[PDB]
């Protein structure tokens, strides 16, 4: 039959192409060419064609010979998988070291060896950080296990896989070198985040949710357990940074793999179409496409025997990116997968023209086509016009295997439902909604009586003896024991916080029902849970978030017990906010989700249940006396702090002759009486002494960083100012915050609070951060202090004391008011704008445009050369930070605003004239000339001297600051006149203005 002949031809092709270099025993093919190495990604990718051929042969075998062929293919791919797994399992020490903290030195090697599976290079001669390879390996391992090919034999391998799951679970906040092993855009590799790694890791994490490695004949302990919060975080990160691969690359063709056949992890198909169209418009060429803009690989320049690209990429690597047909061969598979046919034929016809015929007349895919070294000038004027020639190695197993698999799939022998048995092709189907269940409990009989007074029927903590409730930290400590082994030196999952997605589900521990309360009602960590409105808003946000995704099965369950702190001052009734929240929970509409209340008895029959099997059994004495006798919280806090700093970090004060009362002990019991008075004047002080740290700070920091913003900690000036431009570990971030905060102590708590508020508000309303590029905490706090001082008309110390006393909700309200933006009226506005440096949305583009027609813009001696226009691009961050550094030389915010206005008016006026100034423009001279003209006009009008005053240290009339921008008497006209006069001063006696 024709099918048999086609299968025989494909088998001959794959045998002659890939299987000829299998390297028996080891099972790992060489990574092409005469390199004598084995890359993990290529080894994983070069097996899909063989797997598909075996799958196609198996269903139509019905014969002894075809049975033998399919058996050989499956056994060979199994051997390759085992050989790949051996190299990773030989390096358990690196995985264990990487499980705690994140560093480049404790990472698995990216290039393993041939026979004997040894190491070839050290830890300082290559970039050994590739999460995508491990993610794709795990995803394909799960897919093959679902297919029915045994790859796992021993139970210790299950523990190793569980450890690797935690090894790759932190990819959403870990920076790696990248798929291209070249760090960021330029050389001298610096670790940075990219969307490809998280996109590859999310699908791998999702695949191993409940897939057993022992097949249909497994047991209780055969399934890998994964969480759900990490998947949601990765999805959010990918959605935030979908259009751009990273913060340094505008677009990368590697995003195709994420949004195509391997590892479908995407939503909002409009984004898929947008990124596909962008890639097609930007990277398409004549015989292929480029990886990314400005790459110099295999170029007649760059001196290839030299690494660490010098910062001289002006035009030496522009429009000469060679080609890469891999993105072309991905498109045919992407089209043929879901529903496209005409695109498949078009891409196949395009690809057949670029093919090269070698020995025995078989398809061969070249790596890249290099531009001729002589015809380089023509390409600069006529891009994508000059013919190219092949260059470099071309035994590309990856592209050849992908093309063979695509051709086999298009031939119709195999169906799309066989390659993926997990049904990952239906990720674009909308989910309508989810109903949320909420249970209400009373802490004691008094609370139950109070709720039954108002008509709310609940049950106490008792009477439900079969069901028990404990906080979520116990759940985290219990989870910290999964996948632990003593012989192999494995410590299990490290301790981490638990989200709402984990506590919602029910749990089974030794034939018992367990329920865990949400984390945000914890009072022994921070004071954020001491405010009722705060509790209400976090509850609403958590309800909305839980109702949003809920990608699990069954209805969720939330337990919200009422504590003693939720009552009023008299302790005889619940607060108005609490009763309003419960009444809104009733009637099935609260926040932005449907809420149904009841009793735990009914929710038991319909709720997700999780079975846990790993838990189954296998003179200071005078000072102390003064402390005892004295009263008032101020004196107690002062003496406790002094004794702690002097002699009592852990020393016993001996205050009680019977019980040894430590300094930490007394400080902790101080919280009990501090909480009752609700005195927000020393609770922050004592929290600073105890050095309490807010949980989930690192995720907030990475969320703030992912929005293309630069963070800053500390008060000015520099070097004390820091700049966190990359994510940092929790301990490193805490120590950096402490060093920036110095000995003021409370500054660290205030900065953490402000960061929490900013992270919370960014998600809800990501539109108020426009016109801002760099966030400085110290300037923000100074702004709040100055605003409070103005509002209360008091001294700075009184304003700071009032700000410290302010409730956290009041602090949030003040921050929102400041961010929204809602003599003495115009000067205050100018001062605020200069302090927050709210530049317009297109200032940098106009600056670049005017720079293109002059030699530079000098400010108070410092000059910005015009040669920078060709070394950078307007979209590049370095240009923006350079202009900001040039601008912020003056300390006065009013001067900064005047500088900005004068620059903008100069850019506007430059459009009318068509000429080149060819000279340095000093804007301070423009401002001084405009001020002199305004002074002369006001003197001509007849104003007395008192009105036309002089500033103490700037020489600019305060009435000029008071002047409105527009109008017939505004500063804009004076600035324009001064700019025109200066331009005429350096013009060849002719303007020739025309528009």
């Amino acid at each position: 039959s024709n099918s048999g002949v086609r299968l025989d031809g494909y088998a001959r092709l794959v045998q002659q192409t890939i299987l000829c270099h299998q390297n028996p025993v080891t099972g790992l093919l060489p990574a092409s060419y005469d390199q004598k190495d084995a890359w993990v990604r290529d080894n994983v990718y070069s097996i899909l064609a063989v797997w598909g051929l075996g799958l196609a042969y198996r269903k139509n075998a019905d014969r002894d010979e075809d049975k033998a062929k399919a058996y050989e293919l499956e056994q060979s791919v199994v051997k390759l998988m085992r050989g790949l797994l051996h190299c990773m399992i030989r390096q358990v020490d690196k995985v264990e070291s990487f499980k705690y903290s994140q560093s480049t030195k404790d990472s698995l090697h990216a290039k393993y060896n041939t026979k004997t599976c040894a190491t070839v290079v050290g830890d300082d001669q290559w970039g050994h950080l590739q999460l995508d390879a491990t993610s794709v390996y795990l995803l394909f391992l799960a897919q093959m296990t679902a297919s029915g090919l045994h790859i796992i034999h021993s139970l210790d391998e299950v523990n190793f896989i569980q450890n690797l799951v935690f090894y790759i679970e932190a990819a959403y906040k870990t920076a790696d070198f990248g798929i291209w092993e070249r760090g960021d855009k330029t050389n001298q590799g610096i670790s940075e985040l990219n969307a490809s790694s998280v996109g590859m890791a999310k699908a791998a994490l999702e695949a191993l949710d409940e897939l057993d490695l022992f097949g249909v004949k497994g047991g209780p302990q055969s399934v890998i357990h994964v969480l759900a919060d990490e998947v949601q975080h990765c999805q959010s990160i990918l959605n935030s940074l979908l259009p751009r691969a990273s913060t340094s690359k505008e677009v990368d063709a590697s995003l195709l793999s994420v949004v195509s056949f391997p590892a479908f992890a995407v939503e909002d198909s409009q984004l898929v179409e947008l990124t596909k169209q962008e890639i097609i418009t930007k990277l398409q060429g004549r015989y292929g496409c480029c990886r990314f803009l400005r790459d110099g690989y295999k170029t007649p320049k760059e001196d290839p025997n030299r690494l660490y690209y010098e910062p001289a990429e002006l035009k030496l690597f522009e429009n000469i990116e060679c080609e890469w047909p891999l993105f072309w061969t991905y498109f045919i598979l992407d089209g043929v997968f879901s529903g496209n046919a005409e695109q498949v034929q078009e891409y196949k016809e395009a690809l057949e023209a670029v093919l090269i015929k070698g020995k025995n007349g078989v398809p061969l895919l070249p790596e890249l086509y290099s531009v001729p070294p002589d015809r380089v000038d023509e390409e600069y004027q006529n891009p994508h016009t000059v013919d190219r020639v092949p260059m470099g190695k071309l035994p590309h197993m990856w592209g050849q295997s992908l093309y063979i698999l695509g051709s086999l799939m298009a031939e119709g022998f195999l169906a799309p439902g066989e390659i993926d048995p997990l049904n990952r092709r239906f990720s674009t189907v909308p989910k309508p909604d989810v109903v949320v269940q909420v249970s209400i409990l009373a802490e004691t009989e008094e609370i139950k009586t109070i709720l039954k007074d108002k008509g709310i029927y609940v049950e106490t903590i008792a009477e439900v003896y079969p069901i028990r409730v404990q906080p979520a930290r116990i759940l985290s400590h219990i989870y910290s024991s999964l996948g632990c082994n003593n012989r192999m030196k494995l410590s299990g999952r490290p301790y981490r916080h638990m989200g709402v997605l984990g506590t919602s589900k029910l749990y089974d521990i030794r034939k018992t029902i367990f329920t865990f309360t949400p984390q945000f009602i914890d009072q022994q960590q921070f004071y954020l849970a001491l405010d009722n409105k705060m509790i209400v808003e976090m509850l609403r946000t958590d309800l909305s978030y839980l109702c949003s995704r809920w990608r699990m099965t069954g209805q969720p369950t939330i337990t919200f017990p009422i504590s003693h702190s939720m009552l009023d001052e008299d302790g005889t009734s619940l607060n108005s906010s609490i009763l309003a929240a419960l009444r809104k929970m009733q009637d099935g509409y609260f926040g932005g989700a449907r809420v149904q209340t009841g009793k735990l008895s009914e929710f038991l029959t319909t709720s997700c249940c999780t079975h846990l099997s790993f838990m189954d059994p296998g003179d200071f004495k005078a000072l102390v006396l003064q402390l005892k006798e004295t009263s008032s919280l101020q004196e107690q806090a002062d003496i406790l702090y002094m004794l702690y700093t002097m002699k009592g970090p852990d020393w016993n004060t001996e205050l009680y002759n019977e019980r040894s009362a430590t300094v930490r002990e007394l400080l902790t019991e101080l919280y009990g009486k501090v909480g009752e008075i609700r005195h927000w004047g020393l609770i922050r002080y004592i929290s600073g002494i105890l050095r309490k740290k807010v949980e989930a700070l690192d995720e907030a920091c990475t969320d703030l960083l992912s929005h293309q913003k630069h963070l800053t900690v500390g008060l000015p000036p520099e070097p004390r100012e820091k700049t966190i431009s990359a994510p940092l570990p929790y301990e490193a971030l805490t120590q950096l915050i402490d060093e920036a905060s110095e000995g003021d102590m409370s500054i660290s708590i205030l900065t953490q609070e402000i960061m929490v508020y900013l992270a919370m508000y960014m998600r809800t309303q990501p539109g108020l951060f426009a016109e801002m590029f760099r966030l400085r905490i110290g300037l923000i706090i100074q702004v709040m202090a100055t605003e409070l001082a103005h509002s209360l008309r008091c001294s700075a110390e009184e304003a700071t004391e009032g700000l410290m006393n302010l409730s956290p909700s009041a602090m949030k309200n003040l921050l929102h008011h400041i961010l929204s933006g809602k003599q003495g009226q115009w000067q205050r506005r100018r001062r605020l704008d200069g302090a927050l440096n709210r530049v317009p949305v297109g200032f940098y583009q106009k600056v670049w445009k005017v720079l293109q027609k002059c030699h530079g813009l000098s400010v108070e001696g410092f000059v910005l050369p015009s040669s920078t226009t060709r070394e950078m691009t307007p979209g590049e961050i370095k240009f923006s930070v350079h202009v900001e550094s040039v601008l912020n030389r003056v300390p006065q915010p009013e001067y900064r605003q005047l500088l900005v206005e004068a620059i903008l008016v100069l850019t506007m006026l430059a459009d009318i004239e068509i000429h080149s100034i060819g000279s340095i423009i000093a804007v301070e001279k423009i401002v001084h000339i405009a001020n002199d003209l305004f002074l002369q006009e006001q003197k001509t009008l007849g104003a007395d001297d008192t009105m036309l005053a002089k500033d103490p240290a700037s020489g600019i009339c305060t009435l000029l600051y008071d002047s409105a921008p527009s109008g017939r008497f505004g500063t804009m006209t004076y600035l324009s006149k001064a700019a025109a006069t200066y331009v005429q001063e350096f013009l060849p006696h002719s303007i020739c203005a025309m528009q």
Binding site: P24, V25, K67, S76, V78, K79, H153, S154, F214
Partner: protein, 900 residues
């Protein structure tokens, strides 16, 4: 960081047995899966470790030696070698055979271990390398080998038995499991299996020459091997081992075994002489053999033995903290009972070893214990643990393959088919005129007849791999049993005839009596050692030059006897070849498609080259031509050019002409010139060595070389050719004919050579020369170089006769002394004399002190006999030696009859 191969394999087998037992439950909750996966992982790891070393296998395939031996000990963490071969030997073949047997057993069970086709090639090369284990000595199971422990290798019967069992198991089996067409089969040679069986049978009563008995003989005649299918001899060996090695706390390794005893010290790897005498009486006890005995008992269906061994094993067993059973490795005696135990054997109590309380265990012992307990508890059946049916009872040994014939065990009435093919049409019609029916090769057009070299080349082409580098099956001649089958090459049937019929450069192939005898011997060999299904095929060819006029009658006699139907008690059948071919199973080889003289030496030595050339040109006598060619070769060289081409070509032509004319002296001279040797000396020397005798190669009255261990053909050839260049001219061919005749006679009449230990060809040559001279009497003695092969054979058989009266007793004594014959029981009589001789015995100036021989050797040890023979070999006159031996026998008898 050290690991063996036996313990891991035994643990894997125990895990597989436990999983097989657990398979019987449909709700096993994956317990069986873990055990199958662990066994598969262990097998894969061992296979990877074996295939890691590839150069050593290729080297061992050509020149086996301890240097080229495969390593057996390596690091566990990375699977790499750790300790040098100069401190462990690394020569052990039992492990490979046991691994192959367990692997084929597991594959037949239903497991999968082989991935691709390269593993098939590796298994084929492993089989090829292990096929030649019957000659190379091993280091033994215990790694010590000799009891003296000096650094010598010896033959072990257990290794031969295990290799034979693996060879039987691996024959004709699909390695891929359920599915397989032509790329999962293994080919075996019957000659190697036959030789292994002969070696096992010859060396079965005694495990080794230096060991009377050993406990290592148990796992080879038991469940792991099940290779002794003799019943009476197996029972005798079992009774002997039980009687001689039974102990209170278990079974000892062997007598006089100072293995990790109290007196042993960790400062001398090799034991000093006479230390073994001091080391007796403190031998350790190993209770692991109780489990093997219990397994044998349950396999044989004898519950009483199982109960008795369970009751014996109950008290010695230890317990853990949780009470889990413990099997300690060995038992030792404290130093305060070293001497008291010697007086009373076993009356005192021993002490447990370190691995009997906590922190140390014995995985092999625990695995054997759990296997034995599982077998005893009836949780499984003997059929399940033996899917291949290694052990069969007496009533089923009727139609098995490779073990017993269809006629029954105690029956031998096989009928062999014989095919008659002519050579020429004239010979065919000449035979037909006398009533003889033969068919010309031109009338069997569908059938083709090929020589033996084609099959050897086809076998050589097999087993070649390019990824690793494989040379395939070595170029070795194929035995008669292999050629007795019919093959199919490229769709064409291939038949071959035995190597006796092809033209041979030697001279005895022209004597028809030798051909009659050798075809009769081949027929007897086929009758005795044929076990395949289907009647064997025999091909005979008759050549026109064979009759040669007057020599045409006895050929008629043999062929008429063949037509009658019976040849010396052997039944034969004759018919057309095509009729026999049809309806018969044909072997398939499918790999190919996939892939007095007037010249004296002294007188003519100084003659010039031109004179010698002219004399050669104008002379017609054969002897003068041969001597002139020899002088030219010695003086000028083999590359010289004469009137008839090169010197070598002229020598070959004159040698062939002499063979055609059959003048024996010239043929022998030419054969000596051509430096040709027979390809059967190695089997003869190896069977002589395995028998217990010794052979020495040399000339009478000159230097002689003694051989005590098997050697490569190259070294023996070089030694004999150097000796031949030293002393004489034609002694090479005479020695070859004598050795082939002696080997044939001892193979067909072993009882004839009884009483002789050292076989010397030169002394036997002098013996028949003297006898022929005596027979000649007044007539001058005939030269032995001109004797026909039949006359030489008759003379050798006449001298080999036990001799009778009538002739002079001096001649009889001379013949007996020349043959080095010794009376039966002479060695034991000498030993008893030495025991009752306080001073010693001095002969020919040699001294035999009593203390070292009594403190080193024992009653039946062969090295004491070797020392006695060396002492007695200094006698020059053989008659004097015979008289001395008779006097020694008389002294022994007289002294034994009276102890006063």
């Amino acid at each position: 960081q050290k690991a063996k191969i036996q313990d891991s394999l035994y643990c894997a087998a125990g895990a597989w047995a436990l999983a097989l037992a657990y398979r019987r439950i449909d709700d096993d909750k994956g317990r069986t899966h873990e055990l199958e996966h662990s066994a598969i992982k262990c097998m894969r790891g061992i296979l990877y470790c074996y295939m890691r070393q590839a150069d050593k296998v290729q080297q061992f395939k050509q020149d086996p030696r301890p240097t080229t031996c495969l390593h057996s000990v390596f690091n566990v963490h990375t699977g790499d070698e750790l300790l040098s071969y100069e401190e462990y030997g690394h020569l052990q073949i039992n492990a490979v055979s046991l691994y192959l047997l367990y692997l084929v057993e597991m594959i037949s069970s239903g497991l999968q271990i082989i991935y691709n086709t390269d593993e098939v090639s590796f298994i084929q090369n492993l089989v090829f390398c292990v096929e030649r284990v019957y000659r190379v000595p091993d280091f033994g199971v215990w790694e010590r080998g000799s009891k003296y422990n000096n650094g010598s290798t010896e033959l072990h019967s257990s290794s031969v038995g295990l290799a034979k069992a693996a060879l039987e198991a691996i024959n004709g089996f699909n390695l891929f499991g359920n599915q397989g067409c032509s790329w999962s089969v293994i080919f075996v040679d019957l000659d190697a299996h036959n030789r292994n069986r002969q070696t096992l049978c010859s060396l079965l009563p005694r495990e080794s020459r230096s060991h009377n008995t050993d406990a290592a003989l148990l796992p080879c005649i038991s469940y792991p091997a099940f290779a002794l299918d003799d019943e009476v001899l197996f029972s005798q060996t079992l009774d002997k081992v039980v009687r001689k090695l039974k102990g209170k706390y278990g079974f000892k390794r062997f007598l006089r075994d100072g293995y990790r005893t109290s007196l042993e010290d960790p400062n001398r790897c090799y034991y000093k002489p006479a230390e073994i005498k001091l080391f007796d009486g403190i031998e350790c006890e190993f209770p692991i053999f109780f489990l093997y005995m219990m397994i044998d008992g349950v396999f044989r269906g004898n519950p009483k033995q199982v109960q008795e061994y369970q009751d014996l094993l109950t008290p010695v067993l230890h317990h853990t903290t949780e009470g889990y059973p413990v099997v300690p490795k060995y038992y030792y005696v404290p130093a305060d009972f070293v001497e008291y135990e010697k007086n009373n054997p076993g009356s005192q109590k021993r002490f447990p070893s370190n691995c009997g309380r906590d922190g140390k265990l014995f995985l092999w012992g625990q695995a054997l214990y759990i296997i034995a307990k599982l077998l005893a508890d009836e949780l499984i059946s003997p059929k399940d643990i033996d899917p291949v049916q290694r052990y069969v009872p007496l009533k089923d040994q009727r139609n098995v393959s490779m073990r017993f014939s269809n006629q029954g065990p105690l029956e031998n009435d096989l009928v062999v088919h014989v095919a008659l093919i002519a050579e020429s049409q004239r010979l065919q019609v000449f035979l037909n005129t006398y009533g003889i029916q033969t068919q010309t090769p031109q009338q069997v057009e569908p059938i083709q007849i090929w020589p033996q070299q084609e099959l050897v080349k086809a076998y050589l082409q097999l087993g070649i791999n390019e990824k690793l580098g494989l040379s395939g099956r070595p170029d070795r001649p194929i035995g008669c049993l292999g050629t007795s089958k019919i093959y199919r090459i490229l769709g064409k049937t291939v038949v071959c005839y035995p190597i006796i019929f092809d033209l041979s450069d030697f001279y005895m192939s022209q004597d028809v009596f030798l051909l009659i005898d050798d075809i009769k011997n081949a027929l007897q060999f086929i009758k005795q050692y044929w076990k395949m299904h289907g009647r064997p095929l025999f091909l005979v060819l008759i050549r026109e030059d064979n009759i040669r006029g007057s020599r045409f009658n006895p050929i008629l006699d043999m062929l008429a006897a063949l037509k009658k139907g019976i040849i010396g008690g052997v039944k034969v059948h004759v018919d057309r070849l095509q009729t026999l071919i049809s309806g018969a199973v044909v072997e398939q080889l499918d790999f190919l498609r996939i892939s007095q003289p007037d010249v004296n030496i002294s007188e003519w030595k100084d003659k010039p080259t031109h004179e010698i050339l002219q004399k050669l040109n104008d002379c017609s006598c054969l002897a003068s031509q041969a001597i002139l060619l020899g002088i030219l070769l010695k003086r000028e060289g083999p590359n010289f050019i004469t009137k008839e081409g090169t010197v070598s070509d002229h020598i070959e032509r004159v040698y062939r002409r002499a063979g055609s004319q059959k003048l024996w002296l010239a043929v022998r001279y030419g054969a000596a010139f051509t430096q040709k040797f027979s390809s059967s000396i190695a089997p003869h020397i190896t069977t002589f060595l395995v028998h217990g005798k010794q052979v020495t190669l040399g000339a009478f009255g000159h230097e002689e070389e003694v051989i005590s261990n098997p050697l490569s053909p190259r070294v023996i050839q070089n030694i004999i050719y150097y000796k031949c260049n030293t002393h004489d001219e034609r002694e090479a061919v005479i020695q070859q004919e004598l050795v082939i005749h002696i080997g044939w006679i001892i193979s067909n009449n072993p009882e004839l050579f009884s009483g002789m230990l050292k076989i010397r060809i030169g002394w036997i040559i002098h013996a028949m020369e003297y006898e022929l001279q005596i027979r000649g009497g007044d007539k001058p003695a005939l030269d032995l170089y001109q004797l026909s092969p039949s006359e030489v054979k008759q003379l050798l058989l006449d001298i080999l006769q036990p001799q009778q009266n009538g002739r002079c007793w001096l001649n009889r004594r001379q013949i007996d002394g020349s043959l080095n014959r010794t009376p039966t029981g002479f060695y034991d009589r000498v030993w008893q004399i030495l025991e009752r001789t306080p001073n010693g015995i001095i002969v020919a100036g040699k001294h035999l002190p009593q203390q070292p021989t009594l403190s080193d050797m024992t009653m039946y040890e062969m090295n004491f006999s070797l020392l006695v023979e060396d002492t007695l070999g200094n006698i020059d006159q053989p008659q004097y030696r015979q008289i001395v031996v008779e006097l020694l026998m008389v002294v022994s008898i007289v002294l034994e009859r009276n102890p006063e």
